[PDB]
Amino acid sequence: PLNAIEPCVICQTRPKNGCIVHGKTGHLMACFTCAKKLKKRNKPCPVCRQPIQMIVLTYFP
Amino acid sequence: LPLNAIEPCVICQTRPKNGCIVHGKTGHLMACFTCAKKLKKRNKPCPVCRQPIQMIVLTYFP
Ligand SMILES: [Cl-]
Ligand SMILES: [Cl-]
Ligand SMILES: [Zn+2]
Ligand SMILES: [Zn+2]
Ligand SMILES: [Zn+2]
Ligand SMILES: [Zn+2]
């Protein structure tokens, strides 16, 4: 996934570490800060429009 | 920026890192969904932090 290393598609600054979770699937295209704002404002997933169940701060060990 | 995100699953060394191991509010992404599901199914902890595995999230990269 060559886009995994590109910046947050919302702020184009921070890395993609704000995983938007819904059930057993996640869309990772946004930083924790950007993804938390969406959760806080009760917005859906930007790409699939499923509700945001949680934000997971994603590390690549 | 996490340049290691595009390296393969550290377990099978084949499939991409799309098996996010979730525990509390954090996730360790270093394994494919297949490999991460086997760990969860067999009730193993997170390979790198040993926290219990709450869930595996099949991670897509829009
Ligand atoms: Cl959250
Ligand atoms: Cl699971
Ligand atoms: Zn952002
Ligand atoms: Zn989504
Ligand atoms: Zn694997
Ligand atoms: Zn862990």
Author numbering:
A (entry chain DDD): 431 to 491
B (entry chain AAA): 430 to 491
Provide passages from the article that reported this PDB entry:
The importance of the ubiquitin ligase murine double mutant 2 (MDM2) as a key negative regulator of the tumour suppressor protein p53 has been studied extensively. Second, it promotes the proteasomal degradation of p53 by recruiting Ub conjugating enzyme (E2) thioesterified with ubiquitin (E2~Ub; ~ indicates thioester bond) via its RING domain and mediates ubiquitin (Ub) transfer from E2 to p53,8 where Ub is preferentially conjugated to lysine residues located in the C-terminal lysine rich region of p53.9 Although the relative importance of these mechanisms is context dependent, in vivo mouse studies with ligase defective MDM2 resulted in the same lethality as MDM2 knockout experiments. The RING domain of MDM2 has been discussed as an alternative target to stabilize p53.19 The rationale for this approach lies in MDM2′s ability to still bind and inhibit p53 when MDM2-mediated ubiquitination is abolished, thereby preventing uncontrolled activation of p53.8 The RING domain gains its E3 ligase activity through dimerization with either itself or the RING domain of its catalytic inactive homologue MDMX to form a homodimer or heterodimer, respectively. The dimeric RING domain arrangement is essential for E2~Ub binding and activation as demonstrated by co-crystal structures with UbcH5B–Ub (en dash indicates covalent complex).
We identified G443 as a single residue being responsible for the pronounced aggregation of MDM2h, which could be eliminated by a single point mutation G443T. Since the G443T substitution produced a stable MDM2h dimer, we wanted to understand its impact on MDM2h’s structure and function. We purified MDM2hGT on a large scale with the aim to crystallize it in complex with UbcH5B–Ub. The structure of MDM2hGT and the orientation of UbcH5B–Ub are indistinguishable from the structure of wild-type MDM2h bound to UbcH5B–Ub, indicating that the point mutation did not affect the ability of the RING domain to recruit UbcH5B–Ub. G443T is located near the UbcH5B binding site and is in proximity to UbcH5B’s K4. However, in all MDM2hGT-UbcH5B–Ub complexes in the asymmetric units of both datasets, the G443T sidechain is not within hydrogen bond distance of UbcH5B’s K4 and in one instance UbcH5B’s K4 sidechain could not be modelled due to poor electron density. Based on these observations, the G443T substitution impacts neither the RING domain fold nor UbcH5B–Ub binding. Indeed, SPR binding analysis showed that the G443T substitution had minimal effect on UbcH5B–Ub binding. Consequently, the autoubiquitination activity of MDM2hGT is comparable to the wild-type MDM2h (Figure 5d and (e)).
